[PDB]
Design goal:
The structure is a homodimer.
Chain A (H helix, E strand, L loop, with lengths): L2 E6 L4 H12 L4 E8 L4 H11 L4 E3 L2 H4 L7 E2 L3 H8 L4 E4 L7 H10 L2 E4 L3 H4 L2 H7 L5 E3 L2 H9 L8 E8 L9 H5 L17 H8 L1 H14 L6 E5 L5 E7 L4 E5 L5 H9 L17 E5 L9 H11 L3 H17 L6 H12 L11 H20 L2
Parallel strand pairs in A: 1-2, 1-5, 2-3, 3-4, 5-6, 6-7, 8-9
Antiparallel strand pairs in A: 8-10, 10-11
The structure holds manganese (II) ion (2 copies).
The site of one manganese (II) ion (MN) has 4 residues of chain B, from helix 7.
PDB class: oxidoreductase
Keywords: isoprene biosynthesis, NADP
Assembly: dimeric
Chain lengths: ~375, ~375
């Protein structure tokens, strides 16, 4: 039959691509809910007009003032929509902190959660894992989606290593001396339209890969010491699984997020025609090289945070947010992003306790932000 | 509760590596029978001693005399060994036409057939298939083993294409003109897979790949026009499956036959430590290029033979053996191998009838050998 889908974060890159997948596959999917922030109210109102979906949520009460007929508006709007909407799949593509409560609400409904929101795993950690039942969470991002597919190649007991691929960013192969000179623009500071500035920077700093490694541990239950990273500049192989016999299973496709989005929505069932396959009529090469961990320690630091447990990965990510924003503002140089992450993290052992509530996670983040601000300013 | 394994062709490369896997894993496997040609008695005595297996077949009667206490001797010894030995797995690594009757005997016993002898499937065609239960035939060959693992990546209805990798051989990139002067010495080295003169020649001519395309169609039931070949000089990717969503799932390992051997013996269970894994702490590249089907038509000829069906793939294989022997003996040039296969297939009208008995298959090969010899006499 047809899967009933709630799209949370409908105006962002993931949400709008998921809506296209859904529009191209009305045999497979129907939209039954849409939630957005308020900054792109006009897009949401157009989405309402195009889909006929009236079940909509706007987080920003002020933005909601511009319209007289939104069923859910205000801070908890997306949570309330999830709580009150019958659905088979909740796509959580909200950004940051506001993704966390809707994730928990979605898990409670017993819907499948197609999860794009990183905050939910990286910050919400054991809160989210304790709430989720086996297989309930399906990851949306390309590396995790690749892993989910490759894990089909054997039983859970047969897994030796998970290997995430990394593009290496713009500074792949750069020395520590080279990194001193990095400008915001070089690191991907462009007023690009659909995505925030953080995602290309996190790629360059290798912090994105650290976050992905942490999410991998939480998603697949594999120890950090069995989660490896390889640099693969073509981004054709999206990740790999090495099994106990020595066999490695890899997932490969030309970069296109509609592939992992379609599979997350249809899981376990593939969606015909989602993306173009690899073409072997033209010669190509797929290159692998090790990450220089002396120059890029962000993944090693992510493993340290993840191994420490509790709210430590929330600390890692919040320290990053602050430091990275400071680099983009010209308050620090590029190498100091991961320098500041490390300094905050090493100070943060009080946060290794497991959180009981969302407030607990929020408190660790608050602490980490302030600690990173002091590192940045010298105060 | 270990698996009882009969090893046929025990003194060749696959047989000895199979014995290593079994010796390494006495928990999982035990040898209960050995069969050999009699050309390498030094190895066979050694194997009898180490395994404690006296249940042995020797093909050459003179070699069997020279040994002693051999319960099965003569041209039918391997087949009778199979019929009279209680076992869970028959590993058929016999060479060429010798493998067919033991394959049929093995299937009739109900044991798993771990098939290294591709000739028995290629020639046997539908006769071999009708004798097998679903999943009874488990391929030893690196490409098919990779395919079987990759197929776990989705349901049968989700398969778009099977992609076989080929090394390209020593003459990858050469012109038709350049192949004229090829010697048996030049055709005798293989870049990644160390093997005997016949298997090495077949990788050079691309006939091995054609035979593998046929085996793929018979094993997995995928149409010839959905079985692709890509040249991959490194032989690290051993094959790939493309699914209907655009995702490709690939299997990779450093070349080492103990991996597919170990999987074939203990299917579906992976054998811990069978082989070294790909090492992603060191740089590498995996290169792909299209096959030059002008200079190398052996794969298209295989598809044409396969599509015709019946005893035509037996014709394809038997013509190759005769032309290949003439080449190695210095009677014909290298291009003439595949030229003769083409000439023979063009004349093989009556061989599209499906084989009812082994005698039909043998009749087809007999005719093909003669027609191949006629083609040699003409040049
Ligand atoms: Mn990613
Ligand atoms: Mn092969």
């Amino acid at each position: 039959g047809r899967l009933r889908v709630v799209v949370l974060g409908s105006t962002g890159s993931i949400g709008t691509q998921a809506l296209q997948v859904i529009a191209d596959n009305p045999d497979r999917f129907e939209v039954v809910g849409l939630a957005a922030g308020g900054a792109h109210l006009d897009t949401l109102l157009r989405q309402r007009a195009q889909t006929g979906v009236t079940n909509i949520a706007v987080a920003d009460e002020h933005a909601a003032q511009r319209v007289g007929d939104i069923p859910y508006h205000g801070s908890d709007a997306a949570t309330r929509l999830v709580e009150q909407t019958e659905a088979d799949v909740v796509l959580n593509a909200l950004v940051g902190a506001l993704g966390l409560r809707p994730t928990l609400a979605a898990l409670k409904t017993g819907a499948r959660l197609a999860l794009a929101n990183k905050e939910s795993l990286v910050a919400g950690g054991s809160l989210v894992l304790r709430a989720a039942r086996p297989g309930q969470i399906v990851p949306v991002d390309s590396e995790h989606s690749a892993l989910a597919q490759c894990l089909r190649g054997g039983t859970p007991d047969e897994v030796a290593k998970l290997v995430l691929t990394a593009s290496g960013g713009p500074f792949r192969g750069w020395s520590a001396a080279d990194l001193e000179h990095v400008t915001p623009e070089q690191a991907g500071a462009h007023p690009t339209w659909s995505m925030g500035p953080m995602n290309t920077l996190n790629s360059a700093s290798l912090v994105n890969k650290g976050l992905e490694v942490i999410e991998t541990h939480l998603l697949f239950g594999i120890p950090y010491d069995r989660i490896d990273v390889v640099v693969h500049p073509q981004s054709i192989i999206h990740s790999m699984v090495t099994f106990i016999d020595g066999s490695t299973i890899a997932q490969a496709s030309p970069p296109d997020m509609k592939l992992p989005i379609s599979l997350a929505l249809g899981w376990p069932r593939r969606v015909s025609g989602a993306a173009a396959a690899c073409d072997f009529h033209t010669a190509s090469s797929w290159e692998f090289e090790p990450l220089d961990t002396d120059v890029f320690p962000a993944v090693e630091l992510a493993r340290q945070a993840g191994v420490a447990g509790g709210c430590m990965t929330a600390v890692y990510n919040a320290a990053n947010e602050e430091a990275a924003a400071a680099f983009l503002a010209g308050r620090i140089g590029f190498p100091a992003i991961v320098g500041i992450i490390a300094d905050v993290l090493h100070a943060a052992d009080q946060w290794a306790v497991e959180p009981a509530t969302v407030d607990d996670v929020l408190d660790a983040q608050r602490w980490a932000r302030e600690r990173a601000q002091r590192a940045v300013s010298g105060m």
